[PDB]
Every structure is written in C-alpha cells, then in structure tokens.
Amino acid sequence: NLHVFTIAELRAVTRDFSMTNFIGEGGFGPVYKGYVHDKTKPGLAAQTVAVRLLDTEVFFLGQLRHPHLVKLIGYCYEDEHRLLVYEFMTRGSLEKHLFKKYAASLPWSTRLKIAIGAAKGLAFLHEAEKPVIYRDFKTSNILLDSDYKAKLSDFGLAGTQGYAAPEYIMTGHLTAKSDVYGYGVVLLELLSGRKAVDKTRPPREQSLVEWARPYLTDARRLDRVMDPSLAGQYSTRAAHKAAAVAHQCVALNPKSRPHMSAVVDALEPLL
Ligand SMILES: Nc1ncnc2c1ncn2[C@@H]1O[C@H](COP(=O)(O)OP(=O)(O)OP(=O)(O)O)[C@@H](O)[C@H]1O
Ligand SMILES: C[C@@H](O)CC[C@@H](C)O
C-alpha cells in the first residue's frame, strides 16, 4: 500500500525543502517535516508527514504494516534521489521525553504502554516472512504519537552508546537477539529514567546495564534503579517483574534472551 510521489509534489509537501522544515540528519539521511492535503493523493487522508531523503526494497517495507510501526505512506525515486514519506509522529522520539531530568510527562503507566508497544512492533518485525533486524536499535527508534503510543521507526533501512549486545560488538553478526538486547537497554532506561551510557556519572554508574544488573534481582534495593519521579506510581511487584524482563533481555548469553512476543506477554499484565 504505497503512494508514488514526484519531486514536484514533495516540494509542495515540504515548502521546497525549507530550512524551517528540516528536522535533522542521522545515519539514514535528512528528514523534513511536511503536510499532505486532502487533495494531494487519491485515497490518502490529509496529515502531517516526515520525508526522509535516503542516504525494490521499498515494496517489502510497504508490507510491514502494524499498529506499532511508523506507517510508510509512499516514496519518490527521481534523478538518483530516493525519498520515503512516513506518517509524522507528533511527539517525536522517546529520548527527547525520557532523558529529561524528571520526565514527569512520562508517568509509570505511560512508560509501560511505550514498552509494550515497542515490544509488539519488534515482535512483528522479527516474526515477518523475511525477519527484519535492526543494526542499531536504540531509544531514538521509538517515536511517539499524541497519545504517547509507541511506533518503531527506520525498520528495514539497514556500541559506544550502550545499546549493542556484547557479542554483536565483537562479531558484528546481526541476530534478532541483538535487537532484544537493545530493547532491554531501553526498558532499563524507561525504568530508571537514565540514559544507557552517561560518562558524567561516577565510573560504576556510567553504564546503566552494568550498574543496574546486580539490583534487578533485589526487590528491596530496586528503588535505587527506579526513576525517583515515578515514586508511588508502581507496585513493587510490577517494578520487579519489569526489571526481570529487562534483566532477561540484557542477558550476556543470547540464548537466555526471550523472543519479543514473550516480552509482550510478560509486560501486558502489568497494565
Ligand atoms: N516519522 C517521523 N515523525 C517525526 N519525527 C521523525 C520521524 N522520522 C524521523 N524523525 C525525527 O527526525 C530527526 C532525524 O531523524 P534521524 O532518524 O535521521 O536521526 P536520529 O534518529 O536522531 O539519528 P540515528 O537514526 O542516526 O540514530 C530525528 O529527530 C527523528 O526523531
Ligand atoms: C502529479 C501527477 O502527475 C501524478 C504523479 C504520480 C507519480 O503519483
């Protein structure tokens, strides 16, 4: 289900790629904010979009449709340019909200909903006809809509930050379990409110994974890891189960890490 756009249409959509509509340029290329009006494409509702200038694969991407995957609306191939048109995620990436000092906009139930939605999207990608695996799955791959519903971005386009599973750093072999490790790191970020690696913290606290691991089996000392801004919003039972899910996902042994569908099944009851 993909619309084909010309560059002329995308100039209308992005106000000729105006400097004001540029929102950033990561590893996969620049992204511009835009708008499709009701008349822009037959059968396409008016909406805000994100246009990536990428730096037959698109037909497969168009099949990866799921409530927790950012929708690919269409594409444009012209004069050696390859552009992708996605639904615009109104609240942007999870790290903008989570790495705030307090992250008071993300109460416990919202963080659980984000964790569950991201797990559902990753399980869908891993269970696809051709398994879709990230090279660098991290917090910024989770984008948020106006309801803080989580949807995964940059799927199918493919360790200093701390999201790379240790065996992947050493070998570079892409496996679904490497994504599960990164998911576990993000879950620890959601539980703790802390970035995965923060060199300004004391040496033993720099790595969120290395520092939190001994505490994830200690229910009476789990409060040291939990975000202080969440105090009073969670039961110890729910916090310890979520911590145990994260603990399993960041297991040094990849065979210990769960399938993402099992992560969904373990986290959904906490809501
Ligand atoms: N569909 C979308 N809706 C809203 N914002 C988006 C969308 N896709 C990308 N963005 C935002 O556009 C900016 C550039 O995205 P990009 O993915 O290139 O950079 P990044 O995610 O910060 O870096 P990297 O992907 O290399 O880790 C980021 O702020 C990103 O969150
Ligand atoms: C703009 C009109 O010529 C249609 C463009 C196709 C490629 O969708």
Side-chain angles (χ1 to χ4, degrees):
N1 196 294
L2 283 168
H3 283 282
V4 182
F5 291 79
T6 62
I7 298 282
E9 289 176 323
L10 289 181
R11 289 195 214 272
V13 164
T14 64
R15 244 169 293 131
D16 200 346
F17 302 91
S18 77
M19 55 162 78
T20 57
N21 279 337
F22 176 71
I23 62 174
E25 173 187 53
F28 292 123
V31 182
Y32 286 80
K33 191 181 189 189
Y35 193 82
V36 294
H37 294 89
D38 211 79
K39 70 179 175 162
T40 301
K41 289 287 160 192
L44 182 66
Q47 65 198 280
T48 306
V49 300
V51 180
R52 189 182 288 282
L53 289 98
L54 276 172
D55 179 8
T56 63
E57 134 213 278
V58 70
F59 309 126
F60 172 53
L61 295 192
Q63 294 179 209
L64 304 162
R65 304 215 161 295
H66 186 272
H68 290 288
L69 282 194
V70 174
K71 178 192 192 359
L72 176 60
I73 295 168
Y75 67 93
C76 168
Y77 293 170
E78 195 165 322
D79 294 332
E80 280 182 278
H81 298 109
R82 311 289 179 256
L83 299 91
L84 300 181
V85 182
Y86 291 95
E87 75 172 305
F88 186 88
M89 300 303 302
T90 302
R91 292 204 191 270
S93 59
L94 174 63
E95 99 272 14
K96 172 212 335 201
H97 306 266
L98 187 55
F99 297 168
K100 294 181 168 180
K101 178 168 179 173
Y102 299 96
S105 305
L106 298 177
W108 175 240
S109 66
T110 298
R111 295 191 197 191
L112 282 173
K113 176 171 71 150
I114 289 166
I116 288 159
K120 288 182 177 173
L122 208 51
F124 174 81
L125 292 175
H126 292 175
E127 299 169 1
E129 54 147 326
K130 179 228 85 94
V132 182
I133 294 154
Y134 283 90
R135 290 201 280 87
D136 190 26
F137 183 81
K138 52 190 280 181
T139 331
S140 50
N141 283 104
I142 298 165
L143 308 186
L144 300 171
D145 79 0
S146 71
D147 298 336
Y148 292 96
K149 186 179 165 191
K151 309 191 181 198
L152 303 189
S153 67
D154 297 347
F155 51 88
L157 292 192
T160 82
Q161 304 308 292
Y163 305 92
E167 80 274 6
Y168 174 69
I169 292 174
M170 289 290 105
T171 70
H173 277 65
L174 227 53
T175 62
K177 294 313 182 66
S178 78
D179 284 356
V180 176
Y181 183 95
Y183 177 88
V185 177
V186 176
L187 182 57
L188 286 180
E189 294 179 324
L190 284 163
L191 296 169
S192 67
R194 299 185 182 207
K195 193 182 182 44
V197 172
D198 183 345
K199 291 215 154 26
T200 69
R201 308 192 289 241
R204 61 179 259 98
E205 273 181 63
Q206 291 182 352
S207 172
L208 169 64
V209 172
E210 259 198 3
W211 164 78
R213 218 180 238 123
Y215 296 118
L216 307 177
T217 50
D218 193 331
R220 267 332 247 123
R221 274 186 329 161
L222 185 54
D223 78 297
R224 301 172 139 187
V225 174
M226 301 298 300
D227 193 337
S229 80
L230 297 172
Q233 300 180 21
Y234 55 91
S235 66
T236 304
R237 164 191 180 171
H240 193 208
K241 190 180 187 190
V245 170
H247 191 20
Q248 200 85 29
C249 287
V250 299
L252 301 172
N253 187 353
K255 304 202 311 221
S256 294
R257 304 180 199 146
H259 295 319
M260 290 303 305
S261 61
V263 171
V264 175
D265 283 347
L267 292 177
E268 283 212 278
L270 301 183
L271 267 190

